[PDB]
Structure formats: structure tokens, C-alpha cells
Amino acid sequence: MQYEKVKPPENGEKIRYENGKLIVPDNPIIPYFEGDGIGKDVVPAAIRVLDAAADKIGKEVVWFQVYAGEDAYKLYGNYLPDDTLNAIKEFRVALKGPLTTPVGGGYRSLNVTIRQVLDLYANVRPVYYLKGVPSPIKHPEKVNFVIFRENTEDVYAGIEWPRGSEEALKLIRFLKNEFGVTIREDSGIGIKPISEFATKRLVRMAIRYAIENNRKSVTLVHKGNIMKYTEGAFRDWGYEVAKQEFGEYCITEDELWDKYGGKQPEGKIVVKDRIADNMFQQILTRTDEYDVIALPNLNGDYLSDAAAALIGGLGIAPGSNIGDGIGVFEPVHGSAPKYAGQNKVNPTAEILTGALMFEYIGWKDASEMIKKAVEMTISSGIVTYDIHRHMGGTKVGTREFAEAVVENLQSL
Amino acid sequence: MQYEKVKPPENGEKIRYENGKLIVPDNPIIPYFEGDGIGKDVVPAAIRVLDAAADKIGKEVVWFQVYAGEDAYKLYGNYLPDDTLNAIKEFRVALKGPLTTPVGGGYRSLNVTIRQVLDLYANVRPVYYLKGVPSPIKHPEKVNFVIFRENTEDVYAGIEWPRGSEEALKLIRFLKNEFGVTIREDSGIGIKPISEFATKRLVRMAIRYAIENNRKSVTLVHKGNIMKYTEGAFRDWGYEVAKQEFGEYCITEDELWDKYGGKQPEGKIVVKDRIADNMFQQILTRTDEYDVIALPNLNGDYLSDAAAALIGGLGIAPGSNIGDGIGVFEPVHGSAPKYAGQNKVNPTAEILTGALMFEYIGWKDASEMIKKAVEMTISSGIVTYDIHRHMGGTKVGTREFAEAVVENLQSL
Ligand SMILES: [Cl-]
Ligand SMILES: [Cl-]
Ligand SMILES: [Cl-]
Ligand SMILES: [Zn+2]
Ligand SMILES: [Zn+2]
Ligand SMILES: [Zn+2]
Ligand SMILES: [Zn+2]
Ligand SMILES: [Zn+2]
Ligand SMILES: [Zn+2]
Ligand SMILES: [Zn+2]
Ligand SMILES: [Zn+2]
Ligand SMILES: [Zn+2]
């Protein structure tokens, strides 16, 4: 690719993507940017940990520092340059730290435009428990999900207009004359679009994941009993993909009971569905019963934040945005201005999202090694500010914490 | 008021609604109906407990039996007859069992028409812990919320059209050519209206409730960071109700710290706001910081279910649908056909709903006595089979459970 104010490294190898299969080297070049505030601290930390987890299983990563945020407005005059985008476009996995939405924008607008120009349609969140991390629940150890969230549409597509505005007012009056529907005039208005195409590729991804990692089930979560033609369609469209594209692998829950007596044949993945508002109960009492979960945008967000709270909270949650043969990896957490000062914030989220990057790369044995080592060190009592909370009497800084997990990794 | 196939009782007095107020005599006539299946068990049981609570406090409910569901159908040819709707309209407050929505109609439809004709715009749910109920979390006793959910608008109002229907395609095209919004045509399409009127009605009642019952706070829950003109509007309209209608009582969080140094003078209500997806953590880790919660329709449903899940579940949840000087009190659970008549099901939810009804009509002390009685009974390990599953104890029938809460009620 042609790069402006930064060149790739002479020492690396591209990851490639033919068919739908991702071809990964032993020395892949993977771009990353520190991003804003806290990122200057946590991303370096994840790097050192991933460095050691790489060189532990006879491989190496060749990091390609690109830029985003302040670093970029300082350098290109722009917060999200062509270079950065084009680096991921070319190299297909990136590790990112958190961004700050510049004065003017809209919520997480730099993260919006990244998923847009790169077509990252799925937010993928693994939720699991590490021993030693504090939990508000009695049985956090039973929690083990991977959540696949459609991330392009639903109410979160930002299609809406304020009360009393001319566009709002025309929509309401349109809906009156055309369909005889009557929306009070003093109303703000949004629109909720869910499409066959977008539902079907998110689910197709979740199922393929289940097959490929032999998870026992895929659960479709929807509110299709009140919202028949948006949420209810997500369900019908998700079932269709299981039924029409994966009949080798997928059986319904009707099929589980009548045809298989309730036995789970090897190879087969159960595809089931649960009403969204009941899932909050299900992850608390039937935690055992869910692995891969596939959800629309809103439900995806709520359920996955609910699940993280069981397991130690959002501050340590690893995230991902994924499309076709391409992925971008950041913690679910923001950039926090102050961070108590420097070197005091928790790198665990970034480290574990680093681990998630390796899983998507194929090096899932190295991902596992990172999880165990993060655990061994949190269990030891070595923790930063945020987990000294409910085990108070041992501290240690951001750098010192990453080093201590490095200690534990090399110790296999 | 006229009655086709029933007659109101000989010996009571109407509760009255004058100025903003219920005027409740010692002997109110209150209509009720058993409803379907499980209803023939738990409603009579709740009645036994409410009679003992009223008597102990110098009061009497003159019950007025009316019908809905099957019983109504046989008696009237109408699953939801005129006299039932009218009895509630005349006598203002009603206790109900659950209703199976019959073969092929508007969803939880009987309950839906009830709240439409009677204009019950708030769904109100107390969430609190009773010792002796199994709980998945570490500090259940910190849970003490009352959730006010706007129950007339939002995506739950079913304004919505299937993919490729003329109605949908015409809406999609209109949005493309009028607002420059491109919606994929393989989309089903809903609309999310949120109006001043509905919102201010809900928030008003929530803040009144907090004043009348000395609750420390009202939290507005919304996803207005992403949905500026719907949820965001809910937020701001709620703040306007606080400042402009309840200025003598309501302080913002900023005021709490500026004006009172973070204390909380007695009599001031903190009105604050929080992001809906952040709320699942909050109710688990900062659970003592929340009291009165006011939400729009969909957030209200997810959050209140997720709160019931902390405390023993939906099987035990009291519920309320409320309007201006009018209220219908139902448990949250359905009619669970397969158990009908067995003297098996747990009547705690009806019982607790009866208590919620007592608060509504101003008998707060009786209300407190019934919750207390239920605790003591369950604490003792006197439990119906649902709790017995998990706790062990003395398995007891529906009736003997009620007999046991009566005997506890009388010792207090
Ligand atoms: Cl978030
Ligand atoms: Cl009739
Ligand atoms: Cl429900
Ligand atoms: Zn356990
Ligand atoms: Zn199709
Ligand atoms: Zn089809
Ligand atoms: Zn979220
Ligand atoms: Zn240091
Ligand atoms: Zn009296
Ligand atoms: Zn106004
Ligand atoms: Zn619900
Ligand atoms: Zn027993």
C-alpha cells in the first residue's frame, strides 16, 4: 500500500484472506495505535505481554505503530488519517487503545467511522471469569460466553429527529395520511431498521464460530414477541441460516428433545432462542446453558454489559469489532482523562483483548496462556488500583503489573 | 354504573378520587378477579392474607367478584366483559390474577386492552429482598427499588412493518427521498416515538411516589448518548419535571455536592440520571445508591426483569399498572395452566401484589405487615415447592402457605 507519514516495517509478513479463510504467517505485521490518555500506558503493557506469549510458542509479532486521536491531529492535522485506516485495510488485524471524541462529534464517532470504512459488522465479546477478580455473584466461575452483536443497524443507527422539527413533523403527518397511525405531535422520533442481510451475516459468523470452536450451542436473543417484524425477524432469519446453510451441524431445540431424546450428539450444535428481557435472569441462574449468543444491536449491548458485571465489570472487558477477514481489537472501556496520574490504571482489559486478537489469528494456545497468566497474577495479590478495592493491602503500578504477568507466562 | 351479569356488594363504600387524591374509607369495595389457571389458587390466598392485615389495622375490604378469561367467556361470551372494566372504573382499584391470552390475538392482549381502555400508563414494580429466598448474588438485602416504566410508547407500541410489505417499502423510500437516509429494502421497520406528554406523566408520578414514601432518589435511565432525540429527550423532560414542578424537593447531583457537601438533607430528593446499559453493573455493585427508578418502556422492562433476577426472580414479583387515581394490581407471572387446582403454586407474588395495592390506598402499615409476614414465613423455611427446590424446608401447599403468613401477621 502507499503510506504517507509512516512506512510499514521491513521485517514483517502480511496476513492474507482468500475464500473466507484467513492465512496467517509466523511473523505477521500487525498495526496498533496507543490512542488517547490511558492508551499510552495500557497498550505498551499489552504489547510486552503479547511479545512474551508470542516468543513462548515460537512465533513473533512485528508491530506497526500507526496513529489516531491527538497524536494524529498533531501529526496529520486529522484525528483518523488515511494511513491508519489503510494499515488495517492492508494488514487486517489491529490492536487499538481507546479514543477521545473531539469537541464537535457524536458519542464514539471515530470508532463509528472505523467500523464503517472497514465494514466491521460484528461486535464480538468474550465473557469469562478469572479467579481472584472480585465478583458480586456467588458463582462467576460458571460464566463462559461469546457474544456476537450485530453492530450496523437497529435503533443505534442514529436515524431519528427531535420533537417539533420539520423532519419529525413530516414523518408523523406522513404516517397519519398514509397508514392511519397516530403519533402524538410533541414526540421525538426514531426508526428501527433490521435487515435480512445484516442479521444473516452476524448469525452466520456466530454459527461458524460455534462449529469451529465446538461450542455446544448458539442462542438467538430477541424481543420478537412484542416486536414481530424487527426482533421477530432476527429470530426467523437466524433460524433460516441454521436450517438452510448449516443443516449438517445445526438442530433446533424441538429437534433436540423429540428426535434426540434430549441427548446432545457429538458434532451437532443446538440453535435456540430466548426472549431478550428474560436473558438477564438466564445468565444468573442457568449460566451453565449458554455458550455462543447472537443478538441485535441494542440487546447485544445490554446483555453483554450485564454479563461483564457478573465477571468483574466492564473495566476489565475485552472487545472486538470484526468483519470479513478483518478485525480491530480494543477494550470495551473509555480513555479516562485523569487516571490518578500516570502508571496507575489497569492494563488487564487491554492485555485480554490482546489475547482475543491471538484467538482470531489462530494462535489460541497463546491466548489461553495469557488468560492463565493474567489469572495467576491477580490471584497472587499483585493488582493495580481498581482490584485493590476488594482485596486491600497489596498495590503495584501499570508497568509493574504487566511485568508480573510476563513473569507468570514464561513460567510454564 | 350498570352491571349486566353481576352486582356490586351491599355493604361497602367507593374509594373516591378528588383533587389529586384517593379518598379511601375503612370499608372500600375493591373488585378482583381470579383470572386463568393459577389464578383460582393464588388470588384466594392473597385475599386470606389481605383480610387478616386489614382487620388487624381496623379496616375491611368489601370484595367484588368480577370475571375475565375463560370464566368470563363461559359466563358472558366475552373474555373481558363490560362489567369487569366498569367495576374497575367505578371502584378505582382492583386486584387480578393472570390471564392467558386466548388462541391468536394482540399478545399479552387481555392485559393490554385493560390498560388501554382504563388508560393505565405506568407500570410500577417494587423490587426488594425477602430473607430466605434463594439469590444468585452476594448482597441481596441491599436491593430496594421501585421501578416506574412508561408503558404506552417506545418500540413496544408496535408501530412496525414487515420486510418488503408495501407499507415498509413506502416508508423506506420516503426516508431516502425526503431525509437522505438510505435504509436497506430487505429491512423490517419499526418506529420509536417518545413524547413530552407520556414522559412527564411517568416522571411526575415517580417523583410524587418518592416524596410520599421518603425515598432518597429518582434515577432517570436512558441511552441518550446514542439516541439523542428519543431517550435523550426522556432524560431532559424528566429533569424539566424535577426542576419546574418539584423545585422545593429535587436537587441534582451537582447541587448535592455544591450545596450540601455530599450529605443529603432529609426531605431533599436527589434526581440523577444514568446510561441504561451501565445500569446492570450499577444495580449489582452500587445497589444501595438506587431507589426510585424512572425509565421508558423497553429499558423499564429489561431493567426491572434484571432486578427481579437479583432477588429471587420473576416468579415472586409483585406488579402494578397505574393511571390517574386508578390502579390494577397483578403479579408479574403468567397463569401456568399445568398446575391449575393442585394447591401447589407459590402465592407470594399475589400476596405481595395485595401489599402493593394496600400502599396505593394509603394503608402503608398493613402493607409493611404483609411483607414482614411473608419473610418470617419463608425464613422459617415454610415454603411452597418452588423455593423448596433450592432451599429445602417444609414443602407446603398454597393454602397452608397463606395460613402461615396469617399466623405470622397476627404475632406482630
Ligand atoms: Cl459501552
Ligand atoms: Cl359484554
Ligand atoms: Cl415479562
Ligand atoms: Zn460456584
Ligand atoms: Zn433471503
Ligand atoms: Zn426465507
Ligand atoms: Zn454498553
Ligand atoms: Zn513504578
Ligand atoms: Zn377507622
Ligand atoms: Zn416543554
Ligand atoms: Zn419483561
Ligand atoms: Zn422438606
UniProtKB/Swiss-Prot annotation, chains A, B:
Subunit: Homodimer.
Role summary: Catalyzes the oxidative decarboxylation of isocitrate to 2-oxoglutarate and carbon dioxide with the concomitant reduction of NADP(+). NAD(+) can replace NADP(+) with low efficiency.
Catalytic activity: D-threo-isocitrate + NADP(+) = 2-oxoglutarate + CO2 + NADPH
pH dependence: Optimum pH is 8.6. Activity is maximal over a broad pH range of 8.0-9.0.
Annotated NADP(+) binding sites: 100, 333-339, 346, 385, 389
Family, similarity comment: Belongs to the isocitrate and isopropylmalate dehydrogenases family.
Its EC number(s): 1.1.1.42
Domain note: Consists of three domains: a large domain, a small domain and a clasp domain.
GO biological process, one term: tricarboxylic acid cycle
Protein name, entry field: Isocitrate dehydrogenase [NADP]
Gene giving rise to this polypeptide: icd
Any one GO molecular function term: isocitrate dehydrogenase (NADP+) activity
Temperature dependence (free text): Optimum temperature is 90 degrees Celsius or higher. Thermostable.
Cofactor binding mode and count: Binds 1 Mg(2+) or Mn(2+) ion per subunit. Mg(2+) can partially replace Mn(2+), resulting in approximately 70% of the maximal activity with Mn(2+) in vitro.
Binding of D-threo-isocitrate, residues: 109, 111, 115, 125, 149
